[PDB]
Design a protein around this nucleic acid. Structure first.
Ligand SMILES: [Mg+2]
Length: 223
DNA sequence: CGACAG
DNA sequence: ATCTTGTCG
C-alpha cells in the first residue's frame, strides 16, 4: 500500500521539529460525512530495548469483522520524546503499511492528532504521508486544557488550546479514565468524536481499531 | 520548577 | 512503552 515519503526520518530532534512546523501547514481539517466501510487501527509493542513490532488491523464496519492483518518487526533508534513520537513509531508503521492490501477509509492511531504542541501529532503526521483521513486516540493528555467529564458512561468535554477547539475528552467506560480524541488529516473534531463514539463497543474503554491492534501487538511478541 | 502521547 | 502475580471490585 503506497504513500509519499515527505522527508527523511533520522534527524536530530531540532530538525525534526522544524520539519513538523513546516508540515502542520498542509493539514486539511475537512469533514467526513457518511459512514465508513473499511476502518484500520495501529499500534506498536517493544520486544527489545531497540526493537519494535508494528501491527495494522483493518476492520469491516459496522460488523467489526477482521478483514486483514499485517506486521513488521525492526530496529528502533530514535528515543521517545514527548511531542516527537512520529519519529519513533512512524517509520516502522510505514514498513507494515507497505504490506497492506485493503484500502482503509480512515486509519486510527494510538496517540494524539491535532492536540499537539505544534498541531502535528503522529496521527496528523501519518495522514499527510498516506493521504487518507486519520484520527488520533490517546490514553493520556499531552497538550490542551479541559474539564474532566462526569464518570457517567457517555459523558464528554472539549479539548482546548485557548478558545480554539482541538479535540475532546470522552469517558467511554465508567470507573475508568477518559480517552483523548483529536483529528489527524482530512478530518475534523465533530466528525472524529462521532466516528470514535461509533467504534467503541459497550463495556470497553478503548475503540476496536486500536484495542485489537494492541492485542496482536503484544501477543505477536510471544505466541 | 513542573509538564510531558508511547 | 516496560519491569511483574496476585488480587480487589
Ligand atoms: Mg501503544
Amino acid at each position: 500500500m503506497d504513500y509519499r515519503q515527505l522527508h527523511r526520518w533520522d534527524l536530530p530532534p531540532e530538525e525534526a521539529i522544524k520539519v513538523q512546523n513546516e508540515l502542520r501547514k498542509k493539514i486539511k481539517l475537512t469533514p467526513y460525512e457518511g459512514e465508513p466501510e473499511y476502518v484500520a487501527g495501529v499500534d506498536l509493542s517493544f520486544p527489545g530495548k531497540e526493537e519494535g513490532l508494528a501491527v495494522i488491523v483493518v476492520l469491516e464496519y459496522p460488523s467489526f469483522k477482521i478483514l486483514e492483518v499485517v506486521s513488521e518487526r525492526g530496529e528502533i533508534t530514535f528515543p521517545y520524546i514527548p511531542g516527537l513520537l512520529a519519529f519513533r513509531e512512524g517509520p516502522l508503521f510505514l514498513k507494515a503499511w507497505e504490506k497492506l492490501r485493503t484500502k482503509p477509509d480512515v486509519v486510527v492511531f494510538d496517540g494524539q492528532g491535532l492536540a499537539h504542541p505544534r498541531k502535528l501529532g503522529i496521527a496528523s503526521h501519518m495522514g499527510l504521508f498516506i493521504e487518507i483521513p486519520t484520527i488520533g486516540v490517546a490514553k493520556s493528555r499531552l497538550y490542551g486544557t479541559f474539564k474532566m467529564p462526569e464518570d457517567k458512561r457517555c459523558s464528554w468535554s472539549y479539548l482546548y488550546d485557548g478558545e480554539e477547539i482541538i479535540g475532546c475528552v470522552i469517558r467511554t467506560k465508567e470507573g475508568s479514565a477518559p480517552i483523548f480524541v483529536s483529528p489527524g488529516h482530512l478530518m475534523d473534531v465533530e466528525s472524529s468524536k462521532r466516528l470514535i463514539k461509533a467504534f467503541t463497543l459497550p463495556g470497553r474503554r478503548i475503540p476496536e481499531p486500536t484495542r485489537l491492534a494492541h492485542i496482536y501487538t503484544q501477543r505477536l511478541k510471544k505466541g
